[PDB]
């Protein structure tokens, strides 16, 4: 019993009593676990015993304890965890594992990168952001072994600890695995009564956009324990909060005699996956009730389809039908999985082709910034293994494993392909399978695997002459094969025809767009660039929370809500419209930019379903089918 330990425990009791949010969070975890246990008893999921703690609240309550948490976490985190366990045990007596702690908030000088991690930060709580490059196999670690002695018919047990389990060092007492009892009787291992805690080690390298352009990168190992396991995949941007620890003896013992130094790693307490641009982490936003009410009150309006569309990229003049197509693609339709395993597409593919300087790349860059899981690729820059997958070899097991390409990484997401015309044919015929079957089949030497590639694709192409020609055949203008043309749901030809009034209006719009100042910025000061890393949970300038046209942060709240919540179902009144329009398009005498197949019918169904998603309707209506039908007519005529 240590007196300063008890004093720190009592101080964290006072902090937990003052801030009732953590008191409510412990109770909310406990009622969820007890309700699931009662459901399993009567007729699932379990929540881990750890609490998110704000460092700013602790700093306001007690600056000494906050600086103790940051600077000497070994002396301050175990008292606080003991205090949290005491609180949870005092409340859970009426309805066993000790409670853990996680940390959020500003870290100040402790917000570092793997390059910025130095030996002065050892034995300190640090928050480190980077990219996950390597992850190890999840391995169980024996904590208590249970054994049976058949001669006496009794169960024995032995507890095992290692240096990574405790923040404070302890005298290492290595107790061997018992095969005798104290009297010499044979022991048999009771697998299933023993306890094994999951253990992982990941490598966090500094982000390639925050790393210097010529230097070799710096990384650090992070050890994760039971409930922090498998919260990451390789390629994720992460923020790991944990204690920068030194372990063992750096060769000072006689047996060791070498200059690896003291081995250093982060004992992770907290792992936040971060959303960065063109990464595999999907952007998510926490929806408050007020935002849900705003989304629902916009849903009842009649002009909601012409309000969200024009508010996508208001800094681009024209392309009004393309904005509608991008919105319906972001809604993304409903995927059908039949009882015999046959799959039907839900997502919408858009090809744009036409004259240069027509804001195609700007639209691609907008979709890269406004979509939750958009990944940007270029034509010749990416390759066949670049988009689909590749096979490499890991160091430990020596067996071949898979590296996921851009299409696999953008599963349930968005692929923005610029310079679609300049792509190699091998990667084309790779893309044929992805855009329809929505899967990637790898048949390499020894490995045969099917990966999910459920993706929306936006493509920007150019005509073979550099400029679109009205008098020439559009098949001659695009010069793309028929099978790729059929995959894309909507194909838009954007010609830079020039008229005096239109050039006047575009010139005024661009000139008034270049005269924008951000709020809080001086007239002469340059706008600074801060890279956007968002936490993933689970032409008028003054648009402020749905006055006329919505903000981009609110618009992706609407898209997220419509994607998770409503799953519209087709009905007869939409079916008649889409059947009539499909028959008319199949038997039209007019020449079309896009060929007409049975794929256009499913395009009509997906577009009607996507428009129903905009209205937050559980049913697809006639008005959805007609707008989906005459949106297709613009892309064809």
């Amino acid at each position: 019993p240590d007196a300063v330990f008890g004093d720190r425990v009592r101080r964290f009791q006072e902090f937990l009593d003052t801030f009732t949010s953590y008191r409510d969070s412990v109770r909310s975890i406990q009622v969820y676990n007890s309700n699931n246990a009662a459901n399993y008893n009567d007729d699932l999921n379990i929540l881990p015993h750890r609490i998110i703690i704000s460092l700013d609240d602790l700093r306001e309550f007690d600056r000494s304890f906050w600086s103790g948490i940051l600077v000497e976490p070994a002396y301050f985190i175990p008292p606080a965890e003991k205090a949290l366990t005491d609180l949870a045990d005092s409340m859970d007596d009426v309805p066993r594992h000790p409670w853990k702690l996680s940390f959020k908030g500003s870290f100040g000088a402790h917000a570092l990168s793997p390059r910025t991690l130095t030996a002065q930060h050892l034995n300190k709580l640090v928050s480190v952001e980077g990219i996950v490059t390597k992850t190890s196999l999840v391995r169980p670690k024996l904590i208590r072994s249970v054994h049976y002695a058949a001669k006496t018919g009794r169960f024995h047990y032995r507890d095992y600890t290692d240096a990574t389990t405790t923040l404070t060092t302890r005298i290492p007492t290595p107790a061997i695995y018992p095969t005798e009892d104290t009297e010499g009787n044979k022991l048999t291992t009771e697998y299933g009564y023993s306890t094994f805690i999951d253990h992982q080690r990941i490598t966090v390298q500094e982000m390639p956009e925050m790393a210097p352009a010529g230097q070799l990168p710096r990384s650090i190992d992070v050890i994760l324990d039971d409930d922090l396991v498998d919260k990451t995949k390789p390629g994720d941007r992460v923020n790991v909060v944990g204690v920068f620890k030194s372990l063992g003896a750096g060769g000072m013992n006689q047996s060791n005699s070498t200059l690896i130094g003291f081995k250093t790693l982060i004992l992770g307490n907290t792992v936040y996956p971060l959303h960065a641009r063109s990464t595999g982490v999907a952007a998510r936003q926490m929806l408050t009730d007020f935002d849900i009410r705003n989304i629902n009150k916009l849903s009842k309006k009649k002009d909601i389809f012409d309000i969200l569309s024009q508010s996508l990229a208001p800094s681009i003049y024209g392309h009004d039908h393309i904005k509608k197509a991008i919105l319906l693609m972001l809604m993304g339709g409903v995927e059908k999985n039949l009882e015999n395993g046959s799959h039907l597409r839900g997502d919408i593919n858009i090809l744009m082709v036409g004259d240069p300087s027509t804001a195609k790349s700007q639209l691609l860059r907008f979709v890269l910034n406004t979509a939750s899981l958009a990944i940007a690729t270029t034509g010749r820059g990416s390759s066949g293994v670049g988009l689909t997958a590749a096979v490499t070899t890991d160091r430990e097991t020596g067996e071949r494993r898979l590296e996921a390409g851009a299409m696999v990484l953008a599963d349930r997401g968005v692929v923005c392909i610029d310079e679609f015309d300049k792509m190699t044919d091998v990667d084309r015929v790779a893309i044929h399978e992805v855009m329809e079957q929505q899967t990637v089949t790898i048949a390499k030497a020894g490995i045969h695997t099917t990966l999910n590639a459920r993706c929306s694709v936006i493509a920007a192409a150019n005509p073979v002459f550099g400029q679109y020609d009205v008098n020439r055949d559009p098949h001659q203008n695009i010069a793309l094969p028929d099978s790729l043309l059929s995959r894309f749901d909507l194909l838009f030809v954007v010609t830079d025809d020039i008229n005096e009034i239109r050039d006047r209006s575009i010139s005024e719009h661009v000139l008034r767009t270049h005269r924008y100042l951000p709020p809080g910025y001086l007239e002469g000061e340059p706008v600074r660039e801060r890279l956007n890393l968002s936490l993933a949970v689970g032409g008028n300038y003054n648009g402020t929370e749905i006055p006329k046209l919505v903000t981009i942060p609110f618009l992706r709240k609407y898209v997220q809500y419509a994607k998770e919540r409503v799953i519209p179902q087709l009905t007869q009144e939409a079916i008649n419209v889409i059947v009539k329009n499909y028959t008319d398009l199949r038997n039209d005498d007019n020449t079309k930019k896009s060929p007409i197949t049975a794929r256009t019918l499913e395009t009509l169904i997906r577009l009607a379903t996507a428009h129903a998603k905009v209205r937050l309707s559980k049913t697809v209506n006639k008005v959805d089918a007609k707008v989906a039908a005459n949106l297709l007519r613009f892309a064809l005529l």
């Binding site: 390298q205 352009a213 990168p217 750096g250 063109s278 800094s315 890269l368 270029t378 010749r380």
Partner: protein
């Protein structure tokens, strides 16, 4: 010189020059460590101020407990704690940073049939992370000795770094300086009040080039860049100016590119196909030690926040063409390989030069 090092320089301060080819990761050495006996529980502290040794623990944990020889307590409660009984208490121990560097003799003066010779060097504390590989340095250090386990008594030489001097300083966004003194701040304000500042700046651009005044004005405009706009919908508007110079051979366009490379704070001069061993745009290869993806280099990325001077712009590879297009317009480079997907900054102005077909330009 590195190859004129001798046994007479052993354990003496040497001043020597070269190029650094590798910098290792930072290791953690103990300065102050608090140790405790395993069963005896005797508490001791060790202070280390010497980190000069390599492949050796010149200071280590004591081989037996120090409680008995001290005899500090009157009671003194045969008891032997054992060999190496001490355990390091890490939460109360202190550490510094140690870095391994490798210095090579400069490749300009190397014998033709010989591999260039190099030396392993050690730095600690504030001498670490002060130099990147590729930098030409002067180094003051102790020519020292270690045994590595080729001769019965042969020791490998190494240098304990006492001081690093960077002969020239490379220019990038990370090494850029934002601080300004008051006298140069006022002196630059006296420049802006001159109504003929435009004329004197255009005359200062390539003084040894006759004519091409409009091109020199355009170079002045290119060097400044323009106001960059970030809009509430997120669509970024670029302010950097890209200028192309098409023309007949021998008309000082390459000299204009070289002068822009010299005068720009950050600048990279390359050809259309790149350099001899430095590529164009962005190169994402694997780490030579850990096999993990990293950005090896590239002209358009190394000169972020600066100017890329592309000579012979007509002759270019196909992947470089689309990367150059994207990096001109969106000021970013999208990289999507099987291991890594990213969009990285290439906010740089392009000054390109090219020749037309059939030799000279044809008016017809």
């Amino acid at each position: 010189p590195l190859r004129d090092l001798d046994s007479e320089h052993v354990s003496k301060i040497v001043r020597l020059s070269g190029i650094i080819i590798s910098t290792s990761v930072l290791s953690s050495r103990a300065t102050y460590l608090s140790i405790m006996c395993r069963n005896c529980r005797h508490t001791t502290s060790i202070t280390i101020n010497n980190f000069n040794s390599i492949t050796g623990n010149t200071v280590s944990l004591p081989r037996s407990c120090l409680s008995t020889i001290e005899s500090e307590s009157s009671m003194a409660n045969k008891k032997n704690c054992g060999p190496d009984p001490y355990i390091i208490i890490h939460e109360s121990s202190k550490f510094i940073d140690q870095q391994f560097l490798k210095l090579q003799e400069i490749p300009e003066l190397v014998p033709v049939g010989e591999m260039p010779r190099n030396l392993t060097m050690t730095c600690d504390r504030y001498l670490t992370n002060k130099v990147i590989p590729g930098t030409r340095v002067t180094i003051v250090g102790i020519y020292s000795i270690y045994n590595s386990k080729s001769g019965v008594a042969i020791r490998t030489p190494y240098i304990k770094i006492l001081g690093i001097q960077s002969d020239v300083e490379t220019s990038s966004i990370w090494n850029s300086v934002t601080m300004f003194t008051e006298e140069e701040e006022e002196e630059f304000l006296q420049l802006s009040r001159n109504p003929k500042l435009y004329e004197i700046l255009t005359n200062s651009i390539a003084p040894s080039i006759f004519g091409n005044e409009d091109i020199k004005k355009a170079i002045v405009c290119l060097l400044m860049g323009g106001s960059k706009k970030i809009l509430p919908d997120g669509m970024r508007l670029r302010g950097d100016i890209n200028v192309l110079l098409l023309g007949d051979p021998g008309t000082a366009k390459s000299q204009l590119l070289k002068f822009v490379e010299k005068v720009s704070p950050i600048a990279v001069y390359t050809s259309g196909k790149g350099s001899s061993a430095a590529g164009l745009t962005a190169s994402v290869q694997r780490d030579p030690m850990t096999r993990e993806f990293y950005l090896e280099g590239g002209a358009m990325v190394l000169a972020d926040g600066g100017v890329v001077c592309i000579d012979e712009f007509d002759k270019m590879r196909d992947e470089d063409r689309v990367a150059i297009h994207e990096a001109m317009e969106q000021q970013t480079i999208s990289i999507a390989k099987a291991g890594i997907t990213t969009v990285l900054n290439s906010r740089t102005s392009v000054l390109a030069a090219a020749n037309p077909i059939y030799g000279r330009y044809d008016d017809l």
